[PDB]
Amino acid sequence: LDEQQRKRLEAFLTQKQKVGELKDDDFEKISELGAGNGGVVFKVSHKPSGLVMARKLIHLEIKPAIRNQIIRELQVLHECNSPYIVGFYGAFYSDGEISICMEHMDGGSLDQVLKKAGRIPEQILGKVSIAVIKGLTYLREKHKIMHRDVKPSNILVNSRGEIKLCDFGVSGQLIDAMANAFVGTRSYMSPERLQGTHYSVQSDIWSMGLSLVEMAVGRYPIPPPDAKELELMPMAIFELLDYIVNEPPPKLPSGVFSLEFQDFVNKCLIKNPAERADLKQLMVHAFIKRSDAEEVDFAGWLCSTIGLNQ
Amino acid sequence: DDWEIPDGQITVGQRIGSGSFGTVYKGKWHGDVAVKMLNVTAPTPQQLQAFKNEVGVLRKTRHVNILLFMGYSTKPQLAIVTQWCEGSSLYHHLHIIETKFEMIKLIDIARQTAQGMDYLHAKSIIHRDLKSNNIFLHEDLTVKIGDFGLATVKSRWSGSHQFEQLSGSILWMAPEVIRMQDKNPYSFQSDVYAFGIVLYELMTGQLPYSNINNRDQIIFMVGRGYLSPDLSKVRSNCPKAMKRLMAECLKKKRDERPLFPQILASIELLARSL
Ligand SMILES: Nc1ncnc2c1ncn2[C@@H]1O[C@H](COP(=O)(O)OP(=O)(O)NP(=O)(O)O)[C@@H](O)[C@H]1O
Numbered sequence: 001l002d003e004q005q006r007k008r009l010e011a012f013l014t015q016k017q018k019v020g021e022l023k024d025d026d027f028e029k030i031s032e033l034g035a036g037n038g039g040v041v042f043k044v045s046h047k048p049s050g051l052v053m054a055r056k057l058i059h060l061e062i063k064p065a066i067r068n069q070i071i072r073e074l075q076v077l078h079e080c081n082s083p084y085i086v087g088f089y090g091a092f093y094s095d096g097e098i099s100i101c102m103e104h105m106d107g108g109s110l111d112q113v114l115k116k117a118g119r120i121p122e123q124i125l126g127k128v129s130i131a132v133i134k135g136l137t138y139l140r141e142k143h144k145i146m147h148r149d150v151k152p153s154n155i156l157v158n159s160r161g162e163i164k165l166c167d168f169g170v171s172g173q174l175i176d177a178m179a180n181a182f183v184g185t186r187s188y189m190s191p192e193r194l195q196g197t198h199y200s201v202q203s204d205i206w207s208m209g210l211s212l213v214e215m216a217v218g219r220y221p222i223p224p225p226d227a228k229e230l231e232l233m234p235m236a237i238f239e240l241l242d243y244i245v246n247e248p249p250p251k252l253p254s255g256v257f258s259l260e261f262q263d264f265v266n267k268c269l270i271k272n273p274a275e276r277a278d279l280k281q282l283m284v285h286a287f288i289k290r291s292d293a294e295e296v297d298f299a300g301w302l303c304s305t306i307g308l309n310q
Numbered sequence: 311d312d313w314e315i316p317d318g319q320i321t322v323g324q325r326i327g328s329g330s331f332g333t334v335y336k337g338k339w340h341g342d343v344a345v346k347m348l349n350v351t352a353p354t355p356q357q358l359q360a361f362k363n364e365v366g367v368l369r370k371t372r373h374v375n376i377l378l379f380m381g382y383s384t385k386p387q388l389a390i391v392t393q394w395c396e397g398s399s400l401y402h403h404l405h406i407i408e409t410k411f412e413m414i415k416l417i418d419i420a421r422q423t424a425q426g427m428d429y430l431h432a433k434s435i436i437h438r439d440l441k442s443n444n445i446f447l448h449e450d451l452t453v454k455i456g457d458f459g460l461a462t463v464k465s466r467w468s469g470s471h472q473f474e475q476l477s478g479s480i481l482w483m484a485p486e487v488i489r490m491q492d493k494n495p496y497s498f499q500s501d502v503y504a505f506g507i508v509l510y511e512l513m514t515g516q517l518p519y520s521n522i523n524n525r526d527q528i529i530f531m532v533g534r535g536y537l538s539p540d541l542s543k544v545r546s547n548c549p550k551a552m553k554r555l556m557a558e559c560l561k562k563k564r565d566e567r568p569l570f571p572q573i574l575a576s577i578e579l580l581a582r583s584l
Pocket residue numbers: 033034035036037038039040041054086102103104105106107108109111112153154156167184
């Protein structure tokens with residue numbers, strides 16, 4: 001902990017108390033934030049408390065018994081209070097849709113930020129890997145729940161320079177209902193999960209690695225860049241999963257990034273989960289020890305990139 | 311032989327939901343219809359003429375167990391107009407409302423479904439997307455199979471190449487369809503495989519791979535032949551001749567699966583036999 005975080009953490013709890021029961025008539029739609037293949041998100045104003053929150057709406061077609069369990073499991077999120085986890089205001093159900101009400105992160109997911117930026121600087125990815133390592137720790141120790149879905153679009157960032165995780169598998173029944181989604185474009189699923197089972201936190205670490213590469217180069221790294229696409233500095237879903245399993249993992253270019261960084265992501269992308277680095281080890285890797293000492297101005301780099309004023 | 315609906319004819323009403331290739335609104339048009347605003351918003355004029363041709367073949371389809379294809383429009387956006395079912399999708403009945411049908415009626419649902427499918431294959435139509443979400447129970451009795459065909463609006467074209475981007479729900483997908491490895495993976499036996507999964511639904515009351523909760527894990531293992539629906543989960547009193555039929559549709563290699571002429575036959579045999 002420190003002092004600017006213990007403030008921001010306790011100041012959330014105060015506004016959260018001002019919010020009582022969450023009803024669908026207490027909300028006023030402002031703008032759409034994003035959408036995915038199982039949800040859409042709106043910036044909304046909670047009229048009884050004027051708070052501005054984000055409100056994800058998942059329309060699931062499930063039986064009510066399963067649905068009411070999901071809502072129940074989603075209340076464990078009132079216990080997740082970390083500077084590295086997105087704030088949670090309440091979850092409820094109405095009109096055939098589960099609403100999850102989380103704090104507004106005005107920078108968006110890093111997946112949006114990657115598009116506006118093209119590539120992300122190693123000095124920034126340094127500070128990002130820190131947050132994601134802290135967030136996954138706080139989830140494995142304090143709640144024994146593992147993210148199971150680390151990707152650029154689940155890392156959220158705001159103008160106060162905060163980097164926070166969200167969209168993590170706290171609801172074990174939502175995980176089951178998510179499984180009848182249709183195919184996506186791509187997959188950050190570690191190779192053991194595509195074959196076996198979530199191998200403790202190690203299988204989230206792979207995801208973070210793949211996501212560092214994608215953000216580092218500006219392209220989803222499967223399959224790896226061509227010979228001359230790289231010096232310039234579409235595959236079927238099944239074949240990607242077959243490549244993730246039956247092909248050597250991706251790596252960083254060559255000379256463009258430090259060796260500390262190239263090695264950091266190489267330890268994260270080991271195909272054997274046990275040989276792969278764990279949280280205890282990444283925490284004190286060279287690339288992380290350096291990038292923590294660096295006094296990078298993240299909040300400024302973000303507003304620059306979005307196109308705003310520091 | 312030029313079936314198009316103009317603007318101001320279709321009173322687009324309540325937003326019902328979105329699927330693998332469009333969003334559905336209950337509209338009005340000489341009675342309730344179903345208006346599905348396709349996801350291919352800007353259609354290339356090479357794609358646009360293939361769609362026109364395929365609507366021709368779906369228009370000449372008339373069968374008790376098939377939803378009527380009434381043509382399309384292009385005015386606001388490209389869309390599709392089909393019959394409106396007042397029933398609930400078989401999916402809703404089985405996995406949401408948990409309707410308690412008798413085995414006699416379960417088998418009848420299977421019979422009418424093979425009945426409709428057999429007509430489509432008879433007119434050389436591959437459904438491509440057969441699942442219990444695309445099967446309604448009109449007036450709680452008759453079966454009606456919607457969302458058939460339409461290969462060209464579920465392919466996201468480049469300029470003149472139909473490279474089928476795998477979409478739809480991953481359950482029901484035959485392994486060769488998962489893999490997208492050999493040209494025309496969609497085939498009469500890809501549909502039979504789908505059909506076999508729908509039998510799994512009927513016979514077990516569950517969707518397949520219930521103990522798996524990872525989308526991409528299923529895609530890889532089923533495509534690799536490693537995963538197969540657990541037929542253990544078939545209920546105690548489902549006919550022996552029924553479970554065997556299900557297993558023949560689920561064969562990993564497509565050529566071993568039966569076609570619907572034989573399949574329908576098999577169902578009618580155990581039908582009277584009780
Ligand atoms: N609290 C938030 N603040 C700002 N933007 C948000 C917030 N939560 C979600 N978003 C945005 O909503 C978009 C889509 O929501 P989501 O349903 O998570 O889809 P996704 O994560 O991008 N991909 P997928 O997991 O396949 O659905 C993200 O890319 C973010 O830009």
